[PDB]
């Protein structure tokens, strides 16, 4: 058996003002207090891209050693949901900020493997629904919050490797000072595109996208318990269907929230309000000089020049 998985990580960038709005980012229990007119999608209002947002974006792009496009255009992800105010999510379809990079993940089985990252573009967050009376309550305090969607190349295999990649991403982002990294407050999130296949036959089991995964332990256990499930499913034959699954740490079972009846047509197209942002090589020339020393290479620098063990070097770095 060979298990080919993927990872879609949403990282909350630590910027003062929102990506297109002027409201603050970090918020407390007070609802709708961090929402101006722009976030509420009032008719006639317009968005303006944040500076440090794209700065940190191409910063992560430079840190991950990815070919950054000279131009990147924001597209619209049109879908209807109460958390989404304007009826479309300002993302990036074609020409993302950063594309095709690689990250060296250090595991415990000897070699520190290299993993691929297909892209890492700029998105925007939406509101949150809560358990209350009857009807329901939507809070747009986190709506409009800048997001960085690091999508990894499906080169990542085993679950332990996946945990290693999430930890490496977390560490790199912590070093760059882009996101807090604290998964407890809800800054760093991720999804897993796991698909298993019997070695030898180009036919394989259906793809499983597990969304909303918190801790690393949750990641490992859910990915394993999904892999074995798919293994059973292909062994028995039955019906291999593509579904949107979820994981609860209480019962360690995988439940399907939505069954994917068809490919969701979000209707992507270049946003007429936002002009293509041009990142010239001078920006990258200055920012690369601003680039901090990578931790993965820092422990190795602690191995080479300074007399030290792997353990002490890693835990010191």
């Amino acid at each position: 058996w060979e298990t080919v998985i993927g990872l879609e990580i949403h990282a909350q960038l630590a910027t003062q003002s929102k990506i297109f709005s002027g409201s603050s980012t970090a918020f407390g229990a007070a609802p709708n207090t961090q929402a101006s007119l722009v976030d509420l999608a009032m008719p006639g209002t317009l968005p303006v891209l944040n500076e440090e947002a794209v700065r940190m974006a191409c910063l992560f792009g430079l840190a991950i050693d990815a070919r950054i496009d000279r131009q990147n255009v924001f597209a619209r992800k049109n879908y209807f949901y109460p958390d989404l105010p304007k009826g479309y999510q300002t993302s990036q379809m074609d020409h993302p900020i950063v594309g095709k990079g690689h990250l060296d993940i250090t595991l415990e089985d000897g070699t520190t493997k290299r993993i691929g990252i297909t892209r890492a573009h700029l998105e925007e967050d939406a509101g949150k629904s809560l358990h209350e009376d009857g009807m329901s309550g939507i809070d747009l305090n986190r709506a409009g919050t800048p997001l960085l969607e690091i999508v990894s190349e499906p080169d990542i295999r085993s679950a332990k490797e996946a945990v290693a990649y999430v930890k490496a991403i977390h560490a790199l982002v912590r070093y760059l000072g882009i996101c807090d990294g604290n998964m407890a407050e809800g800054s760093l999130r991720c999804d897993c595109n796991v698909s298993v296949r019997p070695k030898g036959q180009a036919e394989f089991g259906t793809r499983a996208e597990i969304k909303n995964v918190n801790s690393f332990r949750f990641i490992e256990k859910a990915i394993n318990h999904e892999i074995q499930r798919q293994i059973e499913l292909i062994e028995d034959g039955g019906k291999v269907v593509q579904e949107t699954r979820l994981y609860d740490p209480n019962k360690d079972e995988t439940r399907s929230m939505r069954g994917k009846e068809e490919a969701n047509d979000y209707r992507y197209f270049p946003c007429p309000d936002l002009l293509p942002v041009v990142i010239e090589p001078e920006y990258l020339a200055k920012l690369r000089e601003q680039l901090p020393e990578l931790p993965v290479q820092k422990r190795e620098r602690f191995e080479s020049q300074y007399g030290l063990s792997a353990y002490d070097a890693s835990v010191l770095s």
């Binding site: 009376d133 009857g134 892999i227 074995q228």
Partner: protein, 589 residues
Amino acid sequence: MRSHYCGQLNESLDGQEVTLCGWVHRRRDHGGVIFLDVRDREGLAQVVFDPDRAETFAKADRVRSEFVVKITGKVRLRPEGARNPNMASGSIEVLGYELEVLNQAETPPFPLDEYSDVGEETRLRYRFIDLRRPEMAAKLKLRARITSSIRRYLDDNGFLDVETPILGRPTPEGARDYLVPSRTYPGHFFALPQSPQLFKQLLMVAGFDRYYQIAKCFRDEDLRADRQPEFTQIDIETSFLDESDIIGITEKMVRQLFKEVLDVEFDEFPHMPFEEAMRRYGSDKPDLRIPLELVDVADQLKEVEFKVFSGPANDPKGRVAALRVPGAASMPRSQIDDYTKFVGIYGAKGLAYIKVNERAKGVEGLQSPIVKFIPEANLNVILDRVGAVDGDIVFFGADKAKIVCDALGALRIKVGHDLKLLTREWAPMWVVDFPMFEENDDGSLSALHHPFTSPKCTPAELEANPGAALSRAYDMVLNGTELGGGSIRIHDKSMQQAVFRVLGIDEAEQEEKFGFLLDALKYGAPPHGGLAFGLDRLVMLMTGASSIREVIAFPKTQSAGDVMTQAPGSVDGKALRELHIRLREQPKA
């Protein structure tokens, strides 16, 4: 050859010699006098040894803890300053003529009687020496007395003790069935019964007029505290009887049982409707020890400025109920905050209150932050209605019906016990007249109990407005806990079709889910009705035990495994192969 039991040595047997066998509880060595506490099923007794027969002394010095011994001696009346209150036989002793060690004993892991700090896992792991403790033994013996009394009553009243099979057919909807892989039918399973319901109904069809059975039941659900996977139930079903007769026999049984065993008497059992119970207690299992009662008051608080009251007061899907707690105005704000947080856990947005101190001065006689938004007249007739006087506190629950009923119902029981506002006597009751249907989250109608429950009306008044239909179902409640319950079943063709039509189920599901049952029902089923009791909880109440595991011989933990026999365990691959099944614990990278 035992003469008398240790724990049955009264003062009357003085001047008689006795031979008693048992275990050595604890041994006291004073040198010139040796004391032995011998224990059996009936209790402990003291045997004394003086070295005037130093041979018995030699057979007294070697004896240690839990040794199984047989002692013959004479019962001597102990001095006034030596009498023991703790020991039921503790006003007499026995001087040991001859002793014999029937069997030796290794040191018992844990000590008997408090404050020996055994912890529950260790007590369960060595359950075979734990039941040696006289308290546990008294509980189990009490259980035996209970089943004895119930069996005697039911036998004397023409019921037939008939056994129904455990290995039956699996089916969804009700609860998770424990499955048993079939050696003879590969790919097929047996299933442990949730209740002998279907079987008892078949037994009614079979012509047996009156049936009872003390049967084992099994549920594969995640469990609650006071909940076990294997639990014993007293099943009862009768033919050609209405609800009054059934409740009569069963009530009589409970009374006779309580008088046979604990020697208490119950007068008569009040019959309370579900609607009334929900109205003044907010619970389907009222605690009639607590006199505190919920009183509805939302009708006069409709057009009022205060909005958390007026909100649900004009909303039909809810109410605003008040709860008077007497003499409790002296209650500190700390406790108030604790209670608000308590009712918080059942979904109430807030616990409103009024401290009632001086009624003749009106509004300046009611200290509370809410009193300003509510008129003096309404206030006065409210205070009049709830029965409140000087010195009392009145709480307010104002929300959706379910929420206020549960939250105020629980606040009721909680503050009921916390202020010791109950009479300490036994208080039994019957809950009758349930509704027939309820909405199922998404919509539509569904039966709470079973679609086979008899409605009080006709299939026409039923197909008219199903919401106004009451069921002929009944639960028995003691000390606010549900001892058990059942109902009279439907045997009418047009009625079964009426409830079948009203629930949205076509004949496909009628056949797939209940076909064999309906089949058995079609070949001439008599008017029958029944009820079942959770025997475990009944014994738990009758003993005064804290948990249900205390009234079960060899119970299991909350995760369905028992630590003593280490079940469930692992089985060799052979037996696994012969039963036509496979595992799936495979090695991953």
